[PDB]
Scaffold this active site. Structure first.
Site, PDB file in Angstrom:
ATOM      1  N   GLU A   1      43.003  30.746  42.608  1.00 37.71           N
ATOM      2  CA  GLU A   1      41.861  30.500  41.568  1.00 37.71           C
ATOM      3  C   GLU A   1      42.162  29.467  40.224  1.00 37.71           C
ATOM      4  O   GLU A   1      42.188  29.831  39.313  1.00 37.71           O
ATOM      5  CB  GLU A   1      41.624  31.876  41.141  1.00 37.71           C
ATOM      6  CG  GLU A   1      40.809  32.687  42.102  1.00 37.71           C
ATOM      7  CD  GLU A   1      41.223  34.050  41.943  1.00 37.71           C
ATOM      8  OE1 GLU A   1      42.637  34.458  41.741  1.00 37.71           O
ATOM      9  OE2 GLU A   1      40.508  34.809  42.242  1.00 37.71           O
TER      10      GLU A   1
ATOM     11  N   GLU B   1      41.509  37.731  48.391  1.00 39.66           N
ATOM     12  CA  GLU B   1      41.139  38.760  47.518  1.00 39.66           C
ATOM     13  C   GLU B   1      39.647  39.255  47.708  1.00 39.66           C
ATOM     14  O   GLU B   1      38.575  38.189  47.958  1.00 39.66           O
ATOM     15  CB  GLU B   1      41.172  38.382  46.005  1.00 39.66           C
ATOM     16  CG  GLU B   1      42.516  38.249  45.446  1.00 39.66           C
ATOM     17  CD  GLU B   1      42.522  37.658  44.007  1.00 39.66           C
ATOM     18  OE1 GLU B   1      41.643  37.935  43.433  1.00 39.66           O
ATOM     19  OE2 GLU B   1      43.862  37.108  43.607  1.00 39.66           O
TER      20      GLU B   1
HETATM   21  O1  LIG Z   1      40.817  41.793  36.989  1.00 38.87           O
HETATM   22  P1  LIG Z   1      39.406  41.346  36.877  1.00 38.87           P
HETATM   23  O2  LIG Z   1      38.976  40.302  35.819  1.00 38.87           O
HETATM   24  O3  LIG Z   1      38.423  42.135  37.145  1.00 38.87           O
HETATM   25  O4  LIG Z   1      39.429  40.334  38.282  1.00 38.87           O
HETATM   26  C1  LIG Z   1      39.872  40.908  39.458  1.00 38.87           C
HETATM   27  C2  LIG Z   1      40.772  39.694  40.249  1.00 38.87           C
HETATM   28  O5  LIG Z   1      39.568  38.837  40.355  1.00 38.87           O
HETATM   29  C3  LIG Z   1      40.166  37.432  39.950  1.00 38.87           C
HETATM   30  O6  LIG Z   1      39.624  37.104  38.768  1.00 38.87           O
HETATM   31  C4  LIG Z   1      38.240  36.859  38.523  1.00 38.87           C
HETATM   32  C5  LIG Z   1      38.085  36.358  37.184  1.00 38.87           C
HETATM   33  O7  LIG Z   1      38.890  37.444  36.159  1.00 38.87           O
HETATM   34  C6  LIG Z   1      36.437  36.598  36.871  1.00 38.87           C
HETATM   35  O8  LIG Z   1      36.308  36.237  35.347  1.00 38.87           O
HETATM   36  C7  LIG Z   1      36.086  35.271  37.297  1.00 38.87           C
HETATM   37  O9  LIG Z   1      34.531  35.239  36.979  1.00 38.87           O
HETATM   38  O10 LIG Z   1      36.176  35.250  38.970  1.00 38.87           O
HETATM   39  C8  LIG Z   1      37.423  35.943  39.563  1.00 38.87           C
HETATM   40  C9  LIG Z   1      37.058  36.577  40.784  1.00 38.87           C
HETATM   41  O11 LIG Z   1      37.625  35.703  41.458  1.00 38.87           O
HETATM   42  C10 LIG Z   1      41.459  37.130  39.407  1.00 38.87           C
HETATM   43  O12 LIG Z   1      42.183  35.995  39.654  1.00 38.87           O
HETATM   44  C11 LIG Z   1      41.965  37.924  40.331  1.00 38.87           C
HETATM   45  O13 LIG Z   1      43.443  37.507  40.968  1.00 38.87           O
HETATM   46  C12 LIG Z   1      41.850  39.212  39.634  1.00 38.87           C
HETATM   47  O14 LIG Z   1      42.968  40.148  39.648  1.00 38.87           O
END
Ligand SMILES: O=P(O)(O)OC[C@H]1O[C@@H](O[C@H]2[C@H](O)[C@@H](O)[C@H](O)O[C@@H]2CO)[C@H](O)[C@@H](O)[C@@H]1O
Ligand SMILES: O=P(O)(O)OC[C@H]1O[C@@H](O[C@H]2[C@H](O)[C@@H](O)[C@H](O)O[C@@H]2CO)[C@H](O)[C@@H](O)[C@@H]1O
Lengths: 474, 474
Positions: free
Chosen positions: B166, B374
């Site tokens: 990411e 994921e």
């Molecule tokens: O722990 P979170 O914030 O609920 O996210 C779960 C997993 O998703 C990825 O992050 C999110 C991110 O935090 C959001 O703000 C963004 O809009 O998109 C990604 C979704 O892919 C994290 O990188 C992932 O590894 C989290 O643990």
């Protein structure tokens, strides 16, 4: 800040041989499939055909003088295969080549760049009789021989070449809808003819690199960019399928030499995928074009279509607004009226922003320069006293589309030129003479052939000013 | 007729080091940027941080035993750079490598495929201090040193590798929104650090081809496929911009080594495009991945956004539903709630068809196999008396997404595997511990570590059955 049109921008207008030339049996010209098809009852609007069309074969000098008065930088026309090889194969007809030689000389002598289109739907009937034309691999070498003939005779004077004009239309209309010759309704034959046309496109581009090494060549695709109706996931999925089945199916082959896989797999599940011979992929992948030609008129909005849902719908060839109905592929998508744009009297969507979208999509997916080979408004015109044709509706359509081209150029799309359809009024293959696109009115209708005299429309002078200011004044 | 999941489909679950491990200052581990950032007041939910997390560092044997009871085919975890190089680029901390050695041995002794993720956002603070971490080209060779260290130590036992997890999130949140370290809000710096991250990804893939010739490697992209709100041309154009700026901007570089041109021109027009050095394009174009990693949770619907329009909106980090608001880029697009899908309590859209659409888009554009690295539902769970957690909502979410993966495979998308987020409950970087994703409940909350006991949720047994039937019983 909008970027200006580049100084080299090709302000053009366009025609097609069967729709404009006439002289259908003169100077040794053979029958095309459209000569034969249009004479069958019920095939064309009010039986209209191209026996005379607007007689450009005999009046090309007058027409090019009008082009020079307008200040056209480019004129895109198609060469009639059956004028050059009346048999499709066999002996070349010098008289047929001589017409296009005189035309090209007339253009060059007035400072107009010729854009030569190899094929606008008029394969000689002899090849249909001999082996089914586009359904046989024999057409690859016969089409190549015809193209090489033109490359050798005109390559010294023609830089820009279009190979197949709207292959997706003459294939789908000829083999799925049965509305063009050969009048077939057979998707299996459609995809076979389509694959052979893809190989012919690739073969001639390869030949072009040998015979015209400093020319520029490409196919021209009839591009209606797809829209989903809304953000419902099933409607976005319908859009994904529609864009891939209707647009990527052709442009991916032109740009990458590969068919898109999801469409390929769906066709294979129906037993409809084309027969592939050893070397096909190699040839298709090696024939990179210099540009994507784009014929643009409208976008199409689609929605989900259940497996028992809509198939073929009603198509408007009368000019009675609101007579078209939804068409689709059961299971994948169907069309639906876009409530956010208006339509023409033939139910074609008026969507200039859609042209910017389509240009952006081609640049985004293929990184190809684009030559806009066709764009225009087909509408009824009235001749008023004083030889006045006030086609403000056509000016409005053209203005907004050219404005969106300027925005796409500002976005970074490489647009080589813009060929309005059409320079003079001409025959609409399925809609007759009343569905006019010209800058120049031609005096005839579907009943009365009259005298075919030329009359400049108000849009003629509008586009004259566009060219004069290189698009700074729209 | 749906096609079956392929026989060696990688049914997985996933975690990340800072979110799961704890032991933040043990066995020689250095500070990461997240250790430091999360202890700044106001940066995280209720001041939660990864000092202990769910203590997987010490409890990994218990956790792997639960993975084996579930029958997991693959477990995707991330390696903490600061355990291996406490100062980022000096001498190796063997105790750090030894932990991942013990973990990998535990996985392989239970028949579970390790999928190693090089980077999940936790660059050592020493590199931030020395040169600003990802904003400096120095990180390319420092990241390469770290990657090759792992390739040499574990390449014999680890076939599947993820480079940057990411990048679009840790770069945009670190440098545009200021919500991740280093807390910067500067689009020019964001695109500069992003370009350097692109080069670092390319460099380590190049190294991988030498040190692990039989492995498979790819970046993992946080993919929210964009939808237009409706068929209004201005909203479709907004979708074109959103998809290009948010998604092609990263995936085109991963797949093709090139940025998309319209987005590049817009950034150029604002003086925001990254600095390019001689050799950059050749490196980026040479580092073809074996697959596109995809972290999918939700689609995003967008509409037209005027030049004076919406910029940054409210982000929901509390679990109070309906508190998010629109975000966008003035002049290009802004988000809007999709009325045709539900949302979670954190305002994330629930759109399983969107996963099919996203998989179809990647295959259609890049022809790459996909590893879903994921996917999961983050929601409140209740521990009911007797250590029961009935998370039917999580089962419903996962079931519907896995069903759409099977449709995508039937369409012809090559999906290598599916890693649900997350195996056990773990820290959400910005949402605390109550936003749970686990198959295994961990007894702690935002206020107390309690005893960190592991409690199998109902979805644990559901996924166990999915794996046992290779996805035939969902
Ligand atoms: O722990 P979170 O914030 O609920 O996210 C779960 C997993 O998703 C990825 O992050 C999110 C991110 O935090 C959001 O703000 C963004 O809009 O998109 C990604 C979704 O892919 C994290 O990188 C992932 O590894 C989290 O643990
Ligand atoms: O004369 P028409 O039918 O009004 O078409 C205008 C020109 O456009 C091309 O054909 C059409 C085709 O007839 C339609 O069925 C299809 O939907 O789209 C293409 C537009 O790209 C031809 O190039 C030309 O002969 C027509 O005059």
């Amino acid at each position: 800040h909008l970027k200006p049109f580049p100084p080299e921008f090709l302000w053009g207008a366009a025609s097609a041989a069967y729709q404009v030339e006439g002289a259908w049996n003169e100077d040794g010209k053979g029958l095309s499939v459209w000569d034969v098809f249009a004479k069958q009852p019920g095939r064309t609007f009010k039986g209209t055909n191209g026996d005379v069309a607007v007689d450009h074969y005999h009046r090309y000098q007058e027409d090019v003088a009008l082009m020079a008065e307008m200040g056209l930088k480019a004129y895109r026309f198609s060469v009639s295969w059956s004028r050059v090889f009346p048999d499709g194969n066999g002996a070349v007809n010098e008289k047929g080549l001589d017409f296009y030689d005189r035309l090209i000389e007339e253009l060059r002598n007035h400072g107009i760049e010729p854009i030569v289109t190899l094929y606008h739907w008029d394969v000689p009937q002899a090849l249909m009789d001999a082996y089914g034309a586009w359904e046989s691999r024999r057409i690859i070498d016969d089409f190549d021989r015809y193209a090489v003939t033109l490359f050798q005779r005109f390559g010294d004077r023609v830089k820009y070449w279009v190979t197949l004009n709207e292959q997706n239309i003459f294939i789908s209309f000829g083999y799925r809808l049965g509305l063009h010759p050969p009048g077939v309704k057979d998707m299996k034959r459609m995809y076979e003819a389509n694959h052979i046309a893809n190989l012919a496109n690739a073969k001639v581009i390869q030949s072009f690199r040998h015979y015209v090494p400093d020319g520029k060549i490409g196919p021209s695709f009839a591009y209606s960019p797809m829209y989903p109706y809304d953000s419902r996931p099933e409607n976005v999925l319908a859009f994904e399928n529609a864009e891939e089945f209707q647009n990527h199916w052709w442009m991916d082959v032109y740009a990458w030499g590969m068919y898109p896989q999801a469409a390929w797999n769906y066709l294979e599940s129906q037993g409809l995928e084309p027969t592939v011979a050893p070397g096909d992929w190699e040839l298709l992948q090696a024939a990179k074009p210099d540009f994507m030609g784009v014929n643009y008129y409208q976008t199409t909005t689609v929605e989900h279509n259940p497996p028992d849902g809509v198939g073929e719908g009603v198509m408007n060839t009368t000019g009675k607004k609101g007579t078209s109905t939804s068409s689709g592929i059961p299971g994948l998508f169907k069309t639906v009226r876009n409530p956010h744009v208006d339509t023409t009297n033939w139910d074609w969507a008026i969507d200039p922003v859609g042209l910017r979208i389509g240009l952006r999509r081609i640049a985004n997916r293929y990184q190809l320069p684009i030559l806009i080979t066709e764009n225009g408004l087909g509408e009824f015109d009235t001749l008023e006293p004083g030889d006045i044709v006030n086609d403000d509706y056509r000016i409005d359509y053209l203005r907004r589309h050219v404005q969106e081209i300027q925005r796409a150029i500002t976005d970074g799309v490489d647009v080589l030129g813009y060929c309005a359809w059409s320079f003079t009024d001409l025959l609409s293959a399925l809609n007759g003479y009343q569905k006019r696109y010209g800058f120049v009115y031609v005096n005839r209708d579907d009943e009365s052939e009259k005298d075919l005299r030329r009359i400049k429309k108000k849009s003629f002078y509008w586009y004259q000013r566009v060219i004069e200011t290189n698009g700074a004044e729209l």
